[PDB]
UniProtKB/Swiss-Prot annotation, chains A, B, C:
The keyword rRNA processing does not apply. Disulfide bonds: none annotated. It comes from Marinobacter adhaerens (strain DSM 23420 / HP15). The active site is at 190 (nucleophile), 231 (proton donor). This is Glucosylglycerol phosphorylase. It catalyses: 2-O-(alpha-D-glucopyranosyl)glycerol + phosphate = alpha-D-glucose 1-phosphate + glycerol. The lineage of its organism: Bacteria, Pseudomonadati, Pseudomonadota, Gammaproteobacteria, Pseudomonadales. SUPFAM superfamilies: (Trans)glycosidases.
Length: 480, 480, 480
């Protein structure tokens, strides 16, 4: 616990420079005052899906670096790493052993064997919540040639763990203990919503079993010195459910709501959300994924969400959709919009700095995506070569490119904002939303004598920060 | 816990029988096991607005009873009474002295004097959030015959208190001290959103000043042994703001949400709210007021509120509207629907018990309005004699009427639910929302060995309640 | 053709006068040339639902008459009688035996016993297609004192038959054999869609089992010299499925379609329907029930149906709704509109006569409801006294009331229209839809030299009928 209440950077292990050592150089050169922590997307050996199919959580993939490169970070920064509670790779030791020894294997129970369910009705099959149009089963061939089907939610390389079996808990406890020994204090629980499988249900976020699993993961992480950040993309009510269980929710509602507020110069729905937002959240504008719509339902009226989708889709590549949706003009249809936050704001520096300041004054720990940190645009060339829609938001940066972009004026304004947010003591106090008209936002933090106040005029995208000098009583105005 | 986690009754002092002694006899005869607490609508001497224009909070109106009639409840029951933080009667001693001695009066500062603001721009006049189509100023003639204007938000007999002056706090502290000495442990802060007046703002729920007033009232209440229930009809986010400040919010979102959920056999929105609902709330289905629409915005999509409004209005009396709102079919236009909750549910007994069952299983202290307790219908005849729309929901019950209505089968079902909710120990534990389809709701409470489960099928209006008998160790079914 | 291609009357046995003899006297006095047939609503002993809970089909209720009174109509006229294939009364001999002897009774298999299905999941309960907001089960106490549940779709007095047992088929064949022996040639199969019960389905119109039951009844009917008119209120496609079964469907699409056509002066959807209308269909404008909306879906665009609903409901009594469907302005929500056809047309004599003229020219045998025959208005007092909404369209006519209403000019116009339709030979030929603009309809019938033409101007509600007289070979104009 006692994670630093400072800005955090979200980055790949190899997207800045070529490896963890190059990323460390950039962080130490420019971000030593700007951030207190890092979320490094999965650096384990993985055979699919951008690192999210790990063979093990106990090894660092050699192509990106070593466990020593990771620990260089744990010295100065908080470290947040993924724990893929839902699945492990088919090349993992446990699954390859299941292929080798079949149902005789000790890890046989660790996986979900479809035959236990029996015949599943068409109605019950339709209920299962998956984006893929293919049943969530993979047929695998054992070494003797027997053909058996195991539950597989995502790519064929990812094999879902069976939380009916105790082995899944031992496997999770084993990973958590190793990771925390490396100095990880924040565990991002990926795809936790899929861990419970029950025919006749959605097989997504089944209550109350989902919280019983979450509570166990949270208790074990506490054993080992780590807090938890469970990840769900769905209705905002689940972030509240996470918050109530003393875990960190994600502020996924903030990006689309802030996008709408700046594009329309409306503050009403943003202020309503700030007044009721969950207490211990990690806030984001952009992530490694894409700007997610379901997390804003209820937070934004449906018509406003449709307006945001129609506005953004002109400046973006094709959105990621929920399965067989059909009518793109529908909020229900769209899962994620693929664009860089800067492109969504139309590359207006004042609008982008306004968004980052509002995020930074929002309760919770603010996380800055590396593409956003450098004010990156949509990477159309990478999407064409990789064939992956999300790569439009995952540009590979050369060290020289980072030096060129760090000097950009919009990035310089952002860096001073991050240093203020990371160091000024008022943010350790309590949050006071202030009265404002429907076209501006007023936010403030108070800690004893320390006080900082943010005013954003959404019409003109002007950002004004006033603070109390730590050395002196007189108030001061941050350049922003 | 200072308050009992049991059902509470909301009643007038004189609407069951003619006085507080008649109310006590009814509570003692039929409700002694059913409720742990009582909210009595204002019993002070008052010249307007159904008791909410109190000359003083230190007296009981002689026509309804005596302070001793009040203490008869305080021995066996928790007691919730209103404190009208915003305004006091013009016949109050403080205001009457102000008319007598003018600005020489020691009480002159207690009121808001319009001339201090000077000229008010039409733009600043438009911002002021009040329902009446009249300016919130009233000219009064002092004894010497000079005319001066004081601010008054509601009827002309209610005169707003000035929270710029310490006299307002002193008065409230005086009221809080007297009320708590009589045995009031829960203070409903009526219309607190109006207490801050600032030109250039709405003069409603001005942040962060409105919470500074709330904190002082809460601290004073706590010193005297009372908790606070501040009352706001507005966006649900204000209830979260109250909950965060360790006060009891109102579950005003629940009535419109349940009505839509039962009328349309849809549980989706209700489960989203139950998953994130605020922590220490007092829940209601019907109140003395009317089913209020702004409290459900965002909780229900705009389309569904429109559906609910048109459905109820087609079979009910005229709604209360927001000031000068032309469109009847707009959410923005309707402030309150005038209907009895039993009539809002079409006098379907099964639907009504299902609604109360869901309220009782919702986290927080459930409050039952006296009209709904007797499953009363719309009183159009009372409205015609009175000239008031709110009286459709404020029927006068004769003692003989109460005995016949208590006997109605639907009321007997409700009483059995209230006894179970008020006494079963699982409710002192934690809440477990359960997975269900989009036409049913499944809720449970667990406290160690105690466990109770509610299943409601919204298509067929069936209620199933299962509970465990700890000594037996076996599940039992509570008939409902 | 087994039936005459002439107008038919739909009437109660006791709604004209007090009995069947009174009805016979009115038919013989005024309709001997106007009509060729009669549909007499149930005259059996029945304990619910306006004669549709028959104790037996082999007895005539003594209050309405005797079997000889039925046989009077048969000798000069076609007779259409209901066969309640789905259910029989709980007072029936077969069900009374089951109450007495329980599962030992010879008739136990005749009813549907809910416990055989076992635990029914909430999803499977939700699929069941029933209008009432209650579960489709009725708990009954056997004389031994046991409580068991039997399936019942409608009122508790109607107990659904079990078509998995042979006893149900033996019961129906016995009814059909008796009814035809009395001279009935048309059997209306009431609520036939409910006969198939399968958990996991809607339990409504389960294909192809529903047609196998339909084929069985038709074979029994044809052997005994009767044709079948199965009654289903749902999508038009079911009328086509019935038509291709060599059975007479109902033209239920026509009443709502014609009402929109006349109220909005639009003929396009009507001509689209007339061009593809199902063959061998009995057409209606008004029935003993209310005007049914689902039968017009797809035939009319949803927006126009919405226009019709809002128009009618604004000036009429409450509609019957589909189960738990909040949205009163929605097509999905509304089952039936409760108002007479004359009132549905604003008591406009020209529009009403034009509607009947179009009906009589539509392919198939036209049926005229007795209230429409006398141009009856909404009967609010009968509905106020009965408590049954449908009674607004089921007025009781005294014999003297009939004598003056027959004399009404709009009724005399209709009578001349019925005589022309019942007797002119062209209607026995082939039907020719004619070109017209979107404001008028032109329909024709040709049989050899006989030819008649109908032109309706929907803007001005003018009716022109031209026919040829074969000996003259000269076009003539018919008063209408």
């Amino acid at each position: 616990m006692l994670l630093k209440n400072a800005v955090q950077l979200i980055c790949y292990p190899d997207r800045i420079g070529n490896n963890l050592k190059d990323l460390y150089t950039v962080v130490d050169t420019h971000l030593s005052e700007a951030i207190g922590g890092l979320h490094i997307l999965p650096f384990f050996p993985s055979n699919a899906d951008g690192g999210f199919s790990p063979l093990t959580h106990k090894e660092v993939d050699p192509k990106v670096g070593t466990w020593d490169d990771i620990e260089a970070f744990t010295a100065k920064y908080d470290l947040c790493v993924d724990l893929t509670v839902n699945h492990i790779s088919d090349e993992s030791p446990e699954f390859t052993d299941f292929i080798a020894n079949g149902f005789d294997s000790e890890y046989a129970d660790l996986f979900v064997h479809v035959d236990k369910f029996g015949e599943i009705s068409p109605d019950d099959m339709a209920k299962i919540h998956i984006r893929k149009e293919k049943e969530p089963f993979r047929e695998v061939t054992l070494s003797d040639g027997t053909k058996t089907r195991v539950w597989c939610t995502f790519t064929e390389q990812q094999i879902d763990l069976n939380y009916e079996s105790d082995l899944a808990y031992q496997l999770m406890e084993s990973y958590i203990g190793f990771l925390t020994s490396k100095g990880v204090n924040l565990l991002r629980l990926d795809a936790f919503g899929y861990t419970t499988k029950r025919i006749g249900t959605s097989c997504f976020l089944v209550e109350p079993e989902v919280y019983q699993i979450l509570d166990w993961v949270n208790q074990v992480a506490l054993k080992h010195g780590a807090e938890c950040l469970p990840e769900v993309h769905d209705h905002t009510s689940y972030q509240y459910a996470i918050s109530r269980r003393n875990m960190h929710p994600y502020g996924f509602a903030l990006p689309p709501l802030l996008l709408y507020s700046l594009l329309d110069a409306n503050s009403t729905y943003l202020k309503n959300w700030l007044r009721m937002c969950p207490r211990n959240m990690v806030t984001v504008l952009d992530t490694h994924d894409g700007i997610c719509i379901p997390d804003v339902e209820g937070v934004l009226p449906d018509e406003k969400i449709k307006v945001l989708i129609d506005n953004i889709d002109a400046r973006s590549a094709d959105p990621i959709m929920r399965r067989s949706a059909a009518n793109i003009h529908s909020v229900g249809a769209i899962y994620q919009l693929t664009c860089t936050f800067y492109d969504a704001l139309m590359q207006n520096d004042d609008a982008y700095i306004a968004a980052r300041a509002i995020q930074f004054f929002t309760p919770g720990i603010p996380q800055v995506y590396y593409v956003g940190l450098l004010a990156g645009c949509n990477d159309h060339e990478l999407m064409e070569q990789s064939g992956e829609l999300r790569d439009i938001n995952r540009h590979y940066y050369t060290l020289e490119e980072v030096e060129q972009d760090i000097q950009k004026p919009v990035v310089q304004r952002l860096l001073s904002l991050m240093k203020f947010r990371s160091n000024y003591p008022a943010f350790d106090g309590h949050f006071e939303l202030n009265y404002s008209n429907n076209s501006s936002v007023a936010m403030a933090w108070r800690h004893g004598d320390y006080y900082c106040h943010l005013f954003v005029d959404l019409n003109f995208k002007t950002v004004k920060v006033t603070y109390t000098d730590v050395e002196t009583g007189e108030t001061r105005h941050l350049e922003c």
